[PDB]
Structures are given as structure tokens and as C-alpha cells.
Design a protein around this ligand. Structure first.
Ligand SMILES: [Zn+2]
Ligand SMILES: [Zn+2]
Lengths: 190, 198
């Protein structure tokens, strides 16, 4: 199953001349290709069956916003937790997603919501959806978490030294999903 | 049963949140004469991080955006005194900040490298006794063996901040997972060679 660290660094665009539903990333020889890194994140979103719970500090990426928009159109249930200062700042894709009907919650606080992760089809959350829809069987799926230092922004995805882990590890995915459920109930609706 | 032993090694997510200090009074009462029942105890979270640093045998390679915590800096100094080789990669701007402990550690002889760019060095990971690094040290010291050790990586959104700059929602993973520790150690090695002193 999936289990790798995505590394962003200064070599991320040395293959720019080659690259010159998104992104569409033609093959290159650059191990550190930033476009490939973004594509790997999008691919996990493209694979979401039932739920995506996203806790993020800043989110401006068109490619990533588009992948979430497609998940909505497939019937995936999306919830977003963010920082109240950034959540509707200029360029925030969270504004756009809220307009489409995605629920958003933020803490009332002077501190920063800097806990950045996305849990796809978390077991606990898929089970909750199963109950709320009164179903007995679900289509096959498995939990995936994406988490690390990176924000879904121009600098985060196309400039900074950053990393994120993508993993199906049962213990990690379960812990992140649990903290999302806890934050969801504790935070303020927008 | 050897594999069970490996599986019992650290592999968990440390989460800081708004409940990190709800147990403050419990600790104070303890102190007047610590354990508490708070799952989210910020003091326990910090202890768990320092526990890994205190176990370092040979190397600590730290790639960090901002480092203002005195408590964590002291754990690094203790490791230095045990003979651990410490290296620091940081952000080119934040390394100049007043609260930064990097300057202090530099004065103790810790080498520091930063990128020469505008963009942020926004990694926040620490590799302890990384296989590729400990083997490098063995070879450089022309030794035929090393003491027992195993790799641990600490990484996430957590910055090593002074209490006065804390209270955020943040996480970090602490794991001995072979694939994860190897990948982080490899990027540290690469950045070390790529970057510049001061
Ligand atoms: Zn490329
Ligand atoms: Zn406590």
C-alpha cells in the first residue's frame, strides 16, 4: 500500500522545459520534480470514495481545489478545518469550496491552526457515514493520510523546502482521523 | 520474537491542541507535594520528544525552520556533551532572529547551514542515529564497529518553540519506520552538500 515521503526542494523545477483535470505531468528524469509531487497528492484525492476531512492552514492551489471539486461531484463528503484568519483571506480556495456547500469550522483563538493533514476514507468516518445513511455494505476503500510541513500554496508546492508523508498506516490514519473528529465537535462554525 | 521487539519501538503521532494545558492546576498541586490524566498534555508531548534526543548515540541531524525553545536546546547540548555529532540546517532568515537558539548552539561548535535564497526552509524534521549517517561516521572515524543503535525520525508541523510562542495546533510523528527514517536522512545528506555556511 501507499507509504512514502514527498520531498519538495530547490531541484523541483530543473525539468521545467519538459513540462513547458490537472496537473497533467509528462514524464521527466527529475527525481525531485515538484509537478510529480503535486500529482501524487491529487491522485490520492482522486481515489477518495466516501470522505475527505481536511485540516489546513492555507490553501490557494487551483489544481488541488479542482481535485476536491471533482470529489464533491462524485459524492464524497468533504469537511474542512482551518485557521480563522486565513480561511477567507484573498486567494483562499476554502472560500470557493464553502460556496459549493462544503462545511468549514475554525477555532476561536489567538493561536494558529497549524495542524495540516488530509484524511481520506478514514475508517471511523466511513463507519459514521455508513450509519447516517443507514447502509449495511460499503464499496471497498481504505484510509490514507497526507500530512507534513506543506501548505497547498504557491510557495508550499513550488518554492519552499517542504515535505509530506502519504501513508495507509493504520495507526497514523486512525490518530489523525480521531483528532479531526475531536476538532470538528469543538470548533466554531463559519 | 525479534520482529515483535522492533514493532514495539516508537511509532506515534504527538498532537498539540487547545487542551494542552487544561491540566495546569493538576501539575501545580502535584508540585506542591508529574502525572495527569490529560491525553493531550503539552508537557508530556514535549517529554516524549526529548526522550528520543536523550537516547541518541551517534548523530542528530536537524532540519528546522525556527528553533527558539530553551528546553529543546538544552537537550541538544546534553547530547553534544555525550559525544553526539549534531548538525543543523535552518531557514536563512529565521536563523537571525533574537529568540533563536541556533546562534547559541553554533557557539558551542554545532555546524549550521542555510540556503542562499528567498524561499523558506520549511522542513521540520530531526533524524537520530540515521543508518546512512551512523555508517558514514563509522567510516570517517575508520572504526570496525559501532555501539548498538537504531534510527528515529521526528517530523511534522511542530516548530521547537519557547512556551511563550506555543499553544498552536500542531503535530509531529515520531517513528523508527525504516523507510521513513531513510528518506529523511537522505534528504538531509543532500541538503547538507547543497547548502552554505553562516
Ligand atoms: Zn519534471
Ligand atoms: Zn498534564
Amino acid at each position: 500500500r501507499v507509504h512514502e515521503v514527498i520531498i519538495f526542494n530547490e531541484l523541483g523545477e530543473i525539468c521545467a522545459a519538459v513540462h513547458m483535470q490537472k496537473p497533467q505531468v509528462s514524464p521527466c528524469c527529475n527525481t525531485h520534480c515538484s509537478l510529480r509531487n503535486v500529482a501524487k497528492i491529487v491522485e490520492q484525492i482522486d481515489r477518495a470514495v466516501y470522505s475527505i476531512d481536511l485540516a489546513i492552514y492555507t490553501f490557494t492551489s487551483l489544481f488541488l481545489a479542482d481535485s476536491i471539486k471533482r470529489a464533491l461531484q462524485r459524492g464524497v463528503i468533504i469537511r474542512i478545518i482551518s485557521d480563522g484568519e486565513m480561511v477567507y483571506s484573498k486567494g483562499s480556495q476554502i472560500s470557493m469550496l464553502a460556496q459549493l456547500g462544503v462545511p468549514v469550522r475554525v477555532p476561536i483563538t489567538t493561536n494558529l491552526m497549524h495542524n495540516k493533514f488530509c484524511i481520506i476514507d478514514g475508517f471511523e468516518r466511513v463507519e459514521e457515514i455508513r450509519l447516517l445513511r443507514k447502509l449495511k455494505f460499503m464499496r471497498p476503500c481504505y484510509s490514507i493520510v497526507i500530512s507534513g510541513s506543506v501548505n497547498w500554496t504557491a510557495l508550499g508546492l513550488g518554492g519552499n523546502w517542504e515535505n509530506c508523508i502519504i501513508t495507509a498506516d493504520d495507526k497514523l490514519t486512525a490518530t489523525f482521523q480521531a483528532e479531526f473528529q475531536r476538532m470538528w465537535r469543538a470548533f466554531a462554525k463559519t
